[PDB]
């Protein structure tokens, strides 16, 4: 859409930011709990993969697949939300922060995880920028950089949230940065469900997004742009 110089609609931008932070919760939860499986805490993987199955059901409600969705098309998203998905997103978002509190109740403040993960893999910030580290690898070491805050793509300048940065560069600080990024992802979830705008889902340029299915059967130019946008 940048190469075609095409803006999506604001409903497409906010559903992109909303499901990108569902995606951020998905990758941070798999990251922390699969790292807990690599350490030896097998149980946050199970207790958080139940919630990951619930968010895969959200993915399957919005697009149709569990993982390989192919939903965020160039020029806005493919289809709409199903009716009453956002109520289930709100009902999951009420109860997920207690699960975050339970997983960091077991794992953050305890001796075993703290002794295994403090002062391990201490990266210098200048050596991290020389090695080309990015995102949570930088935010463990404490250099303040987040692409939703300093170079705002989509509609991420509209939402307001906090950037978790560490102060010692270790495994424990990177895990705490990921857990705090889940909590700030929950804050972006609350802001998206507060200010999701009405509108349409793809771009209304028929040469960029494919046209609607009701207008494809009735209008000829939609059949041309459907045909030569799909072959």
């Amino acid at each position: 859409e940048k190469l075609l110089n095409i803006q999506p609609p604001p409903r497409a931008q906010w559903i992109r930011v909303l499901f990108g932070e569902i995606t951020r919760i998905l990758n941070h939860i798999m990251a922390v709990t699969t790292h807990a499986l690599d350490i030896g805490a097998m149980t946050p993987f199970f207790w958080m993969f139940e919630e990951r199955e619930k968010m895969f059901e959200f993915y399957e409600r919005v697009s149709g697949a569990r993982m390989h969705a192919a939903y965020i098309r160039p020029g806005g998203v493919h289809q709409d939300l199903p009716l009453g998905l956002l109520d289930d997103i709100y009902e999951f978002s009420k109860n997920f922060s207690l699960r975050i509190d339970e997983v960091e109740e077991m794992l953050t403040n305890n001796r075993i995880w703290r002794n295994r993960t403090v002062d391990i893999g201490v990266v210098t910030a200048e050596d991290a920028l020389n090695y080309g580290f990015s995102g949570v690898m930088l935010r463990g070491s404490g250099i303040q950089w987040d692409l939703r805050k300093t170079q705002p793509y989509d509609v991420y300048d509209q939402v307001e949230f906090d950037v978790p940065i560490g102060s010692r560069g270790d495994c424990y600080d990177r895990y705490l940065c990921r857990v705090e990024e889940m909590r700030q992802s929950l804050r972006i979830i609350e802001q998206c469900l507060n200010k999701m705008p009405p509108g349409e889902i793809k771009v209304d340029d028929a040469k960029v997004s494919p046209p609607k299915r009701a207008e494809m059967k009735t209008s000829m130019e939609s059949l041309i742009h459907h045909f030569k946008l799909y072959t």
Binding site: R213, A214, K217, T218, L223
Partner: protein
Amino acid sequence: GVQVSPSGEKITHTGQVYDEKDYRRVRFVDRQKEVNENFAIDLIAQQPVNEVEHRIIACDGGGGALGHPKVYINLDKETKTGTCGYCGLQFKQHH
């Protein structure tokens, strides 16, 4: 109508059959070759012709956005059943 070969093979409705000396029939022993009973050629002869008063009819296959696009069929030649090329429901002028 599902026809039968002299080898007992069901003729597929496109006209595909395997020859009697063919080695590609050996995937069908102790198994079965799938042929549907509802032939798509024979499932249009049961459809009646539609007697309509329009000189140009519009067809969509029923449902609007459910079926095929809304295309327009001429009915001027009364000796020929004016068909819809997506579907095949035969139309005819009332007079």
